[PDB]
Amino acid sequence: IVVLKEGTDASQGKGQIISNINACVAVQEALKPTLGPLGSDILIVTSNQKTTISNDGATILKLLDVVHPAAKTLVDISRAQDAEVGDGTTSVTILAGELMKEAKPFLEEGISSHLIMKGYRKAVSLAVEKINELAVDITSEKSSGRELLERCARTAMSSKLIHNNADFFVKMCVDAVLSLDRNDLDDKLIGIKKIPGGAMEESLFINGVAFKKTFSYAGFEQQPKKFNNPKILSLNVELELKAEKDNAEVRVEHVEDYQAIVDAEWQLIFEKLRQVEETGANIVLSKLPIGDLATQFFADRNIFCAGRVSADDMNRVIQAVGGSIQSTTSDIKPEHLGTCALFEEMQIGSERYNLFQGCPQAKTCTLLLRGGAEQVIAEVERSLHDAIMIVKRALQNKLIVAGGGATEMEVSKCLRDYSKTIAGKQQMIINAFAKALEVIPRQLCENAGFDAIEILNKLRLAHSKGEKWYGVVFETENIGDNFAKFVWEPALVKINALNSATEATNLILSVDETITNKG
Amino acid sequence: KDQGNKKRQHGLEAKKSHILAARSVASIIKTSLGPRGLDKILISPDGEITITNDGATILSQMELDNEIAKLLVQLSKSQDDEIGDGTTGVVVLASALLDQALELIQKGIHPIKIANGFDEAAKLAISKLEETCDDISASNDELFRDFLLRAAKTSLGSKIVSKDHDRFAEMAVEAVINVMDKDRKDVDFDLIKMQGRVGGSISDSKLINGVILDKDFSHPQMPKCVLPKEGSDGVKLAILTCPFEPPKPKTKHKLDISSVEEYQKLQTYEQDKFKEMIDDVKKAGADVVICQWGFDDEANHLLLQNDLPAVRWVGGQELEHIAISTNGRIVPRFQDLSKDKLGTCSRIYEQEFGTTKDRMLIIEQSKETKTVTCFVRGSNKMIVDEAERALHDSLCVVRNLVKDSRVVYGGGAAEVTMSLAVSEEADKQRGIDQYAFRGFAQALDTIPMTLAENSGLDPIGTLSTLKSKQLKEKISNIGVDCLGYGSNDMKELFVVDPFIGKKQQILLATQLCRMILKIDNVIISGKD
């Protein structure tokens, strides 16, 4: 009659560890096509009904929301990969899951997982030491300031639809990173706006901030769109004649009183409307719509206004001209105003776009992209995001290691020799760790269409011949040196990946039982 | 969270399910691709039944949960803004590339090699069409409008327009010329207002430069025409959001009248309000008073003595359309009236249509405007919407013909010439591209075979017949017999498509085919 769990499912034993292994393979198998710049993209449909397609492991695992506890640990460690580094969230989960696959036959042989986890901790400790030996300090050495940024951005943009126009896109990509303080570089500070229509090579770089120009209200052919030093005013409240929401009940029996209450509704609005002119600002920006009466009164005094501007764009305006948002039109102070070097409304893409240009106080920028289709430009923007992260980390981190299979093979190469000196179960565990490091160069060839059998075996040949820098060429299929091909990643990525993947692996291998309470 | 209601398709069984799912959606509109294509019955969620062959309507009316098919809807959505006539053609062409891609997957070829194969296939086919294209406006202006007028007659032959098509084809030519400039050469469809109403026939549909508000002028005694007013500048009208009358409260009325004295006092307020409003019209020099709300009958009586015709109950969006044609402004109140804010037109009159009791109005210009209004009529609702969208389809063709003078004859001709050129160059490439280019040429052959299946002809026999005529003799444009003629030549038959339209059709089709193959995993959750 009595029950221990009161109907709360709890399972233990070696079968629970196997169930944790199958969960790590399921998460790995989903991220395998998303590994590498040429890797395939995953189709994810969230319960929010927003269909997204991306290859970035961070965004992928955040939108899946896997309830499985052992599989959720691989998601939590991927968010740590997005925190400590921010790049490589796809490879850290695949490598951690591969450690679960290589530890599966050891569980059937009767080898305890604690000796397996202890073997990885000694393997990573030797692996990080080899990465420090593979860390090459380079700043001005055999490279200039311009060639270091350009030649590294061309490789990230290679094998893409932008390959032919890459010469123009590297110039805007390098100038985008140099437009910000090299001490603190944030990808969020670089704005990117997609412009439908037009040629890809005609894209422009804006030093200031731009937005969509969502103003739908009539009164056009006025309010000149080109200003030299406009005074930008950030507004909150609603200046439209006929208001959005509220109202009032007024009972009057006279005809002159009918026109009076209509003029009263006008005078109450015109009061705060005239206070905008008393500030003497040429640009009026508000997150709420600016009605026909307001845009007409601004047209007579030659004041430009745009309503219903996104909040994300208004925050960049504050970071551009150094202004501030004031709630009312009365108390507006002079320091809340701001000014740019040039203001123009561009018709590029058969659509009107307001832009601020030449802001000396701007901590952010905006880069416009053009193309024949909105989906193609989105691929250009994401291929640019991969190029920005390489250019950004090049200045922030001067210690680099050869990527694209180069470093992955050298770490796996030496640990096979280090395992010869160690005897016992730890020898087969280190050999399994070095074998688990072979999944990274493998999936890079499988996702790009290259043959995994020939290229990997040929890579194991020349790399064993005394040259440590041989990677996998992503352009023309062959083995080659990525140090010459300029495939570069900082040493902190390879160190934090081996530390985070083994950590998440050690947390899952240490779980004998999963207790889930229902309620 | 919520492990249930989550399905995952990956690897082996995913690639086969994606192609067959896109094939089922494409097989819907295959038979609807052509001038002879078959209609479909579409039922709105409100219960209305409509019958049309338009691909933009069928794909939008169809509600589907397939994410791969949603990419097909986004494919036709982006091209509809660019072109609009390639809706059903791009999906069948993209699915034909998917059907050939599925065959290459079964042969052991990776999807990345297939995507890179179709990429080099498009770049080679574009260069072949760029050499064989011809120009129209490069010859003569009268000859341009000759080919321009006959090009609209071709696109209107698949619709009920075909009877009166000679009239609607001239409408597509005249409507574009007015919204375009010789130096700018920019054709914008927003500058052309498409408007239609039920009743009459398609023979009564005219083309007028101006706007029509469909109003009887609020009173029969007011004249049916408006004079220039003794040497004034055109005819000045007012665009206002307030009616001509004593204004009324929008909450409650409940006016209490104690005796006859209070009723006679409101007579003076109502009479003096009339004089204050009419004086604002005479000082501003305005002829016709156009307002958003109706007018008082006693107010219209004084307008008869002052020779001031008035128009009441005009929509807000209709008020903005007058300010575009007449270069006017929307004026909130009577005291804001000024000569610069009044719309300046040539004249205003009420035009009677046959015995119909509608009796709309027409505001004219007599000089080139920034907007035009296409007037469309029909014996039935669906007839009006068909003739309106068929004329809009011709406007999209004229827009591409002016933007790009390079033209090709596209029906059944282009897919064969593209296939014959790629098939010959497939042997010289010698690699994975050889299977990709051979399947690319076979996927292009789907379009002319589909047209032959919709016209009642052998898709295999007609396709090869078009090939042998373009090989043994010379490379030219010889298309499918769908419309009919003594021969299959598309030149003398005057069936033409824009070269920039054919290039964007084969581009976006190859682009999405690479995006569908770009997806190696599909994870779809439920609705929480």
Helix, strand, coil percentages for chain A (3-state, nearest 5): 50, 15, 35
Burial of B394 (0-12, 13-18, 19+ CB in 10 A): buried
Angle between the A69-84 and A89-102 helix axes, to the nearest 10 degrees?
140
Dihedral of alpha carbons B397, B398, B402, B405, sign: positive
Task: Look at A375 and B70 and tell me if their CB atoms are within 8 Å.
Answer: no
DSSP string, A17-82: HHHHHHHHHHHHHHHSTTSSTT--EEEEE-TTS-EEEE--HHHHHHHH----HHHHHHHHHHHHHH
Q: What's the first-to-final CA gap in chain B, in angstroms? A: 11
Question: How far is the C-alpha of A194 from the C-alpha of A370, rounded, in Å?
Answer: 7
Structure tokens at B105: 């997957």
* CA B417 from centroid of its chain's CA atoms: 29
The CATH-assigned architecture of domain A210-395 is 3-Layer(bba) Sandwich (3.50)
Are B239 and B319 in contact by the 8 Å Cβ rule? The answer is: yes
Structure tokens at B349: 């009159």
Q: Chain B residue with minimal CA distance to A196?
A: B78
Active site residue B134: no
Instruction: Give the residue carrying structure tokens 């069948």.
Output: B92
| DSSP tag of B76 | H
B82 contact residues in A (CB cutoff 8 A): 197
Q: What's the first-to-final CA gap in chain A, in angstroms? A: 22
B78 contact residues in A (CB cutoff 8 A): 373-375
For A350, phi then psi, to 5°, come to 55, 30
- Which has the closest alpha carbon to A371: A352, A388, A348, A387? A348
A41 contact residues in B (CB cutoff 8 A): 518-520
- Which residues 479-518 on chain B approach chain A with CB closer than 8 angstroms? 504, 507-508, 511-512, 515, 518
Mutant choice from A45, A75, A258 vs B, greatest count of B C-beta within 10 A: A45
Are A494 and A131 in contact by the 8 Å Cβ rule? The answer is: yes
- Which has the closest alpha carbon to B146: B439, B401, B371? B401
Question: How far is the C-alpha of A361 from the C-alpha of A501, rounded, in Å?
Answer: 42
Q: Which amino acid is at A68?
A: H
Active site residue B462: no
Which of B31, B87, B371, B510 is catalytic? The answer is B87
- Which has the closest alpha carbon to B19: B116, B117, B118, B102? B102
For B203, phi then psi, to 5°, come to -75, -20
Tally of CB atoms within 10 A around B214: 13
A64 contact residues in B (CB cutoff 8 A): 523
Mutant choice from A161, A253, A350 vs B, greatest count of B C-beta within 10 A: A253
Which of B85, B99, B296, B393 is catalytic? The answer is B393
Structure tokens at A505: 């692996």
Instruction: Give the residue carrying structure tokens 């000396």.
Output: A360
Mutant choice from B77, B112, B369, B400 vs A, greatest count of A C-beta within 10 A: B112
Measured CA to CA in angstroms, residue B43 lies from A317, B24, B47, B57, B401 at distances of 48, 20, 6, 11, 36
Q: Is B359 on the interface with A (CB under 8 A)?
A: no
The CATH homologous superfamily to which domain A139-206+396-400 belongs is TCP-1-like chaperonin intermediate domain (3.30.260.10)
Domains located in chain B, CATH noted:
1-136+406-527 (1.10.560.10), 137-209+370-405 (3.30.260.10), 210-369 (3.50.7.10)
Question: How far is the C-alpha of A234 from the C-alpha of A329, rounded, in Å?
Answer: 10
Q: Which H or E run contains B427?
A: helix B414-429
What is the stated resolution of the deposited model, in angstroms?
4.6
What distance in Å separates residue A111's CA from the closest CA in chain B?
32
Instruction: Give the residue carrying structure tokens 């341009």.
Output: B144
Q: Which amino acid is at B112?
A: I
- Which residues 169-198 on chain B approach chain A with CB closer than 8 angstroms? 188
Q: Chain B residue with minimal CA distance to A62?
A: B1
- Closest partner CB to A258 (pick from B249, B272, B520): B249
Q: Chain A residue with minimal CA distance to B274?
A: A255
Three-class DSSP category at B293: coil
Question: How far is the C-alpha of B111 from the C-alpha of B104, rounded, in Å?
Answer: 8
Any alpha helices (H) in A159-310, and if so which ranges? 166-178, 255-279, 292-300
Question: What are the strands of the beta sheet with A399-402, ordered from one edge?
Answer: A136-137, A399-402, A488-490
Three-class DSSP category at A441: helix
Q: Chain B residue with minimal CA distance to A249?
A: B251
Q: What angle do CA A486, A490, A492 make, to 5 degrees?
A: 160
A295 contact residues in B (CB cutoff 8 A): none
Any alpha helices (H) in B297-413, and if so which ranges? 297-305, 316-325, 381-403
Method: cryo-EM
Task: Look at B522 and A67 and tell me if their CB atoms are within 8 Å.
Answer: no
* Residue A125 CB-half CA count within 13 A: 6
Active site residue B2: no
Residues ≥6 apart with Cβ < 8 Å to A161: A376, A379, A380, A383
- Which has the closest alpha carbon to B376: B142, B114, B123, B193? B193
Number of helical H runs and strand E runs in chain B: 16, 16
- Closest partner CB to B269 (pick from A30, A219, A254): A254
- Closest partner CB to A449 (pick from B113, B504, B527): B113
